[PDB]
């Protein structure tokens, strides 16, 4: 069954969260859309991007390279829709700002606005990990910006517990 999400807490009308590996979730859920926490050249070197691409045996990277050759790099805050290969029907590759490289944190709102083009998404938090944004801030921007249905997979149990306790005790 498509979009078979289970095990999430519902934080808002739009936003759900689970302590999960987004690759394992995408295999179970069969989402119409999985979000990649991409960079502007769609180089899936590690993090969520690397994990999603690894699950596609590099098909995602080859398709991404072709997209970039034909269309040029994305903008920070931008997105493109490509195949979800064996994980999803579509992968929405979204570029959040890398505040470790001095990109404007205000583009995290632009980045999450891309989600609103899809009714239902499985997604990571944006601009976490090596992109350097505070995940609590990222979740706040997500809930303030996304208006459809987003199922967030947070891999790290400690981070998950911190996000949930922070959000629900606000």
Ligand X SMILES: Nc1nc2c(ncn2[C@@H]2O[C@H](COP(=O)(O)O)[C@@H](O)[C@H]2O)c(=O)[nH]1
3-state helix vs strand vs coil in the chain, percent to 5: 40, 20, 40
72 contacts ligand X (rule: CB under 6 A): no
**In this chain, which stretch among 10-18, 48-56, 106-114, 154-162 interacts with ligand X, using CB under 6 A?**
48-56
Binding residue (CB under 6 A) for ligand X from 26, 31, 47, 87: 47
Give the pair of three-digit tokens for residue 133. 């944004």
132 contacts ligand X (rule: CB under 6 A): no
48 contacts ligand X (rule: CB under 6 A): yes
Considering the complex, state which of residue 46 and residue 72 has its C-beta at the smaller distance from ligand X.
46
Give the pair of three-digit tokens for residue 5. 């999400």
Binding residue (CB under 6 A) for ligand X from 129, 142, 145, 160: 129
Shortest distance in whole angstroms from residue 115 CB to ligand X: 17
Helix (H), strand (E) at residue 14 = none
Shortest distance in whole angstroms from residue 139 CB to ligand X: 17
Q: Which of residues 20-39 bind ligand X (CB under 6 A)?
A: 37, 39
Helix axes 22-29, 47-55, angle to 10 degrees: 40
Q: What is the DSSP string of 100-149?
A: GGT--TTHHHHHHHGGGGSSEEEEPPSS-GGG---HHHHHHHHHHH--SE
**Interface residues with ligand X (CB under 6 A)?**
37, 39, 43-50, 129-130
């Amino acid at each position: 069954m498509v979009n078979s999400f289970s095990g999430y807490l519902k934080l808002t009308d739009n936003v759900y969260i689970k302590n999960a590996d987004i690759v394992e979730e995408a295999k179970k859920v069969k989402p119409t859309v999985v979000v990649n926490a991409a960079n502007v050249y769609l180089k899936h070197g590690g993090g969520v991007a690397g994990a999603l691409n690894k699950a596609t045996n590099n098909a995602m990277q080859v398709e991404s390279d072709d997209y970039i050759a034909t269309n040029g790099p994305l903008k920070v805050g931008g997105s493109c829709v490509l195949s979800g290969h064996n994980l999803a029907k579509h992968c929405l590759h979204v570029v959040g700002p890398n505040v470790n490289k001095g990109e404007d944190i205000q583009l995290l709102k632009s980045a999450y606005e891309n989600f609103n083009q899809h009714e239902v998404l499985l997604a990571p938090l944006l601009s976490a990990g090596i992109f350097g944004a505070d995940p609590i801030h990222s979740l706040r921007v997500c809930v303030d910006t996304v208006r459809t249905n987003v199922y967030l997979a947070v891999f790290d149990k400690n981070l998950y517990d911190k996000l949930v306790s922070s959000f629900l005790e606000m």
